[PDB]
Amino acid sequence: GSLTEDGLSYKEKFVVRSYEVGSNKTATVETIANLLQEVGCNHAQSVGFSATTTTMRKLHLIWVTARMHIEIYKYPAWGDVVEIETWCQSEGRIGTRRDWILKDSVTGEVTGRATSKWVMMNQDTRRLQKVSDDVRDEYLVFCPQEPRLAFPEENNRSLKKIPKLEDPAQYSMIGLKPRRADLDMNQHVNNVTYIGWVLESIPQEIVDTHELQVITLDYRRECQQDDVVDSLTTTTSNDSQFLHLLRLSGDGQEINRGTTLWRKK
Amino acid sequence: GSLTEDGLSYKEKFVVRSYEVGSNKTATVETIANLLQEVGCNHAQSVGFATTTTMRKLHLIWVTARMHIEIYKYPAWGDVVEIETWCQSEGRIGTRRDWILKDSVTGEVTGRATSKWVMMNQDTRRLQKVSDDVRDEYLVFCPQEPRLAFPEENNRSLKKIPKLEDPAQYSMIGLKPRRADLDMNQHVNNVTYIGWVLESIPQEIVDTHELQVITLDYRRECQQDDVVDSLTTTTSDSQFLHLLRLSGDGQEINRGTTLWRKK
Ligand SMILES: Cc1cc(C(=O)Nc2cnn(C)c2)no1
C-alpha cells in the first residue's frame, strides 16, 4: 500500500483468501469490513499516527466508532485482487469521518463504497467530547480541505436515522459471546465482530437466496470480553429490508442498532 | 506465491495485518493456522486441484486427522513471513502436509507445522484407505524421497494423546460457531477448533506465557447448529491436556495438548 501523489489519501491492493469467502466463493461482508480496517490502519501509520495524535495521547483521548455504512455492488471472488482507497475528513467539532472506495483491480470499476463516523472519547472515563482546535489542526494537514465524500447524494442512506426494534423480534440469535480471536491488540471487541453478530439473526434462507447490498450500523456502547449478546431482527419490507438490534443478554442494555438491505440473487 | 524450481513445493509471503495480532502485537496461533491453510490451498490450485479426478468420481474427500504446530517466534504486525509447504503420500494410511515458516528479512526458521489427512466418503462419512489410482495421481506433485518438517525420531508430532478425565481443571462452555467460522462449503473451519481449545486456557497463562507447541486430534465434525464445551487440565514450562466435546451428550469432537513457555 501507499499514500497517493498528493498525500491526502491511501491505496492498497488485497488478494481475496480461501478462508475469507462464503458459499458463493466471494468475500463476506466481514472480510470487506476487515480489509477496510486494515487499509485505515495502514493510512494512519503512513502519516505518523499509532489513530491517536500527539495531543490525544497527552490528554488520554481516543477515537471510537459511532456509525459504519457499507454498500457493496459486487463482492470480489476468491483469488481476485481488490483495490481500496481511503481518506479522512474533520467534521468540525462533531468528530471525524473515514471514507473508502473499493475497486476491481482488473477492470478499474467501483465495486463498493463505505463511510464511517468517529467521536472523541476519554479512554478512562468513557466520556464523549467535542474535537478541540489543537487536535483539529493536527488532523487537517493529512485530510483534503475541499469536501470529498464516498456518499455525496442529497438524501443518501448513510445519514438516515435508525429506529429501535420493538419486542417481540421476528428472528433472534441468543447468547453470542466473543472468543479471543474477536478481540483486538488492546483486548477490546473488534468492530467487525458486531457486524457478524447483527447478521447472525438473519435466517439462513435469506442468506442463501439474497446478497447483502447495504448495511448501516450504529455503535452505542462496547461489548466487554466477559459480556453475552442477543441479536434481534425484524423484516421491515424484489428487495428485503431488516431492522436490527444487539443488546446484552442480561439487562437488555443496547449496544448496537442497524438496518440491512438485501437483493435477490 | 509460486511453486519452487523443482515444482515439488510452494512458497508464499504474507504481511501480518492489524486485526491478525494479539496483545503482544504479534500474530495469534489462529492467524498462523489460517496462513497455513491459505498457502496449502494455493499449492493445491497451482498443481491442478484438494480432490483429485479419481476422488470426484468416487465422492471422496480429504479430512484432517491431526494438526501439529511449533512456533519459535510469532511475526510482528507489519512483518513479512514466508511459508513453504509440500505434501507426501503415507502409503494407504493417508497423506501428510508439512510447512516451514521463515522471517523474510533474516531467512531464519520461526516455525514449523505438520498435518495428517485421511480419505473419507463425503456422503456416508466413512473413512477408507488410499487406493492405488489416487496414490499415483498425488505422487507426481510430492517429493519421492522423504522430506519432513519434524524428522527427529520419537518427536512431539506423533505422540499419542490421552482423554481428559472429568472433572476438568478449567472449562469454557456453550461455544457456538457463527457464519464467519464456516468455510465456502458451510463446514466449520479447522482453525475455529484451535480457537475453541484455547478458550479454556486461563487469561493469566495467556498474559504471561507464549504458546510454543499445539497438537490437535480431530475425531468428528462440529455442525453449524452444534454447541461445544472446551475442557483443560494442567499436566505439568506449562503443559495442558485439552478436550472439545458436544455440550449435550458429551460426544468427543477433539483432543489435544499445548506447551507454553514463560515470557
Ligand atoms: C470496519 C472498520 C473500519 C475501521 C477503521 O477504519 N479503523 C481504523 C482507522 N484508523 N485506524 C488507526 C484504525 N475499523 O473498523
Ligand SMILES: Cc1cc(C(=O)Nc2cnn(C)c2)no1
Ligand atoms: C457514541 C459511541 C459510543 C461507542 C462505543 O463505546 N462503542 C464502540 C465499539 N467499538 N468502538 C471503537 C466504539 N461508540 O459510539
Ligand SMILES: Cc1cc(C(=O)Nc2cnn(C)c2)no1
Ligand atoms: C490449519 C490448516 C491447514 C489446512 C490445509 O492445509 N488445508 C488445505 C490443503 N489443501 N487444501 C486445498 C486445503 N487446513 O487447516
Ligand SMILES: Cc1cc(C(=O)Nc2cnn(C)c2)no1
Ligand atoms: C479420522 C477423522 C475424522 C475427522 C473428522 O471428521 N473431523 C474433521 C474436522 N475437520 N475436518 C476437515 C475433519 N477427523 O479425523
